[PDB]
């Protein structure tokens, strides 16, 4: 029912396979259940999405998906074709079909299409009455091609309140997304702003009305890729436990530095467990969640681990 876990979606150096396996172990341990593969600087995911994997790459992706399954974790493989795809080109759709087919042969079942941080090209202006339509048409063709996978995610260009033109409720793009996009495909949402201070319960009910469904949060609360001098070791804060019966999931995009995400993922698990069975803060305090996380963290520091 609920997709709660981590999204490796930051700009910067992507985590190694050793760290990813370790993350799945922590996720299972803390009763979390999902992982979204979205590293912006892994060329095969974004910049060079058309590029197929090599024998070696295929082998580790196979080990990682195997590891993911072993720890009862949902591995969601994402691709960001948005920076240069020709939506109307049948070769571009065939490339996305071949690339996601190779990944399904690795053990992947759950996929995602991301269309964030991306003017239309003449050829697509003929064929498509808008961007929202072009993205939805390609997303729906892939979802059906992939045999309607249970877990399929869609990230809109307008993914936070601030990005909606003119506003959230009146946005023609979100209207189009909610209307024309298949009901079996999930929509990602990062709240009022990219890095939302708070995520009001009124804020997401307003979105659920235009996208005609409950969204999955892509939380950038612990994200630190936007500033070299900043690190976030604080607790999960600003998102009420009342939000859980109103969402299909929460996936936190945390700090680039893997080992600094202990509290980030710890407090989130405490938050998800404090109200996993609800009605469509009373149950959780970040102050108390922070103390519990640092207490568990502290012991780890004393355990010898060599670089």
């Amino acid at each position: 029912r609920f997709l709660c876990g981590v999204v490796e979606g930051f700009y910067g150096r992507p985590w190694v396979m050793e760290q990813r396996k370790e993350l799945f172990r922590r996720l299972q341990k803390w009763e979390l259940n999902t992982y979204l593969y979205a590293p912006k600087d892994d060329y095969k995911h974004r910049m060079f999405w058309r590029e197929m994997y090599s024998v070696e790459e295929a082998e580790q992706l196979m080990t990682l998906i195997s590891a993911a399954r072993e720890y009862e974790i949902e591995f969601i493989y994402a691709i960001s074709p948005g920076l240069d795809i020709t939506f109307s080109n049948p070769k571009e759709v065939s490339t996305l079909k071949r690339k996601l087919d190779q990944v399904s042969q690795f053990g992947c079942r759950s996929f995602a299409l991301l269309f964030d941080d991306i003017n239309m090209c003449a050829a697509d202006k003929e064929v498509f009455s808008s961007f929202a339509h072009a993205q939805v048409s390609i997303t729906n063709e892939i979802y059906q091609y992939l045999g309607e996978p249970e877990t399929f995610l869609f990230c809109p260009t307008e993914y936070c309140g601030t990005f909606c033109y003119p506003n959230v409720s009146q946005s023609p793009y979100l209207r189009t997304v909610g209307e024309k996009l298949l009901p079996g495909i999930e929509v990602l949402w990062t709240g009022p702003k990219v890095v939302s201070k708070e995520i009001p319960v009124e804020s997401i009910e307003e979105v659920s009305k235009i996208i005609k469904r409950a969204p999955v949060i892509w939380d950038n609360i612990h994200a630190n890729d936007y500033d070299q001098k900043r690190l976030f070791l604080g607790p999960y804060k600003g998102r009420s436990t009342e939000l859980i019966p109103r969402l299909k999931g929460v996936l936190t995009n945390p700090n680039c530095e893997f080992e600094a995400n202990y509290v980030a993922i710890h407090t989130l698990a405490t938050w998800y467990k404090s109200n996993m069975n609800g009605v469509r803060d009373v149950l959780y305090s970040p102050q108390m969640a922070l103390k519990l996380a640092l207490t568990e963290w502290l012991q780890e520091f004393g355990v010898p681990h060599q670089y």
């Binding site: 690190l231 976030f232 080992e259 600094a260 640092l294 207490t295 502290l298 520091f301 681990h305």
Partner: protein
């Protein structure tokens, strides 16, 4: 110790909020900055902040000697940048773009 990670988490808290211990130091420092019988107060407050600046280095160095180098190696770069700044704050109390840039600079923005 727990009180150390509580201090560590307070200085690298959340995007829109610094932790209590971090917020206190900044506030107490913004106070010392704005002051020149009533001297005894500034003097006692300057001496107590100086001790605060000295305990945080002590936590910083303690952390650098942790058994878990794997954790340490990921975040000590941040710790080393606030230690450099904690020192001169205390010492203060005691007291292009390439051809792409060449092109983008001639474009309307």
């Amino acid at each position: 110790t727990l009180e150390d990670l509580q201090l560590l988490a307070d200085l690298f808290y959340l995007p829109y909020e610094h932790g209590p211990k971090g917020a206190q130091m900044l506030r107490e420092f913004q106070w010392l900055r704005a002051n020149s019988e009533k001297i005894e107060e500034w003097r006692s407050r300057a001496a107590k902040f100086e001790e605060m600046c000295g305990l945080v280095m002590g936590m910083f160095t303690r952390l650098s000697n942790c058994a878990n180098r794997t954790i340490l190696y990921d975040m000590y770069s941040y710790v080393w940048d606030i230690k450099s700044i904690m020192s001169m704050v205390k010492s203060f109390v005691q007291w292009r773009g390439g051809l792409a840039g060449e092109f983008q600079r001639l474009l309307p923005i």
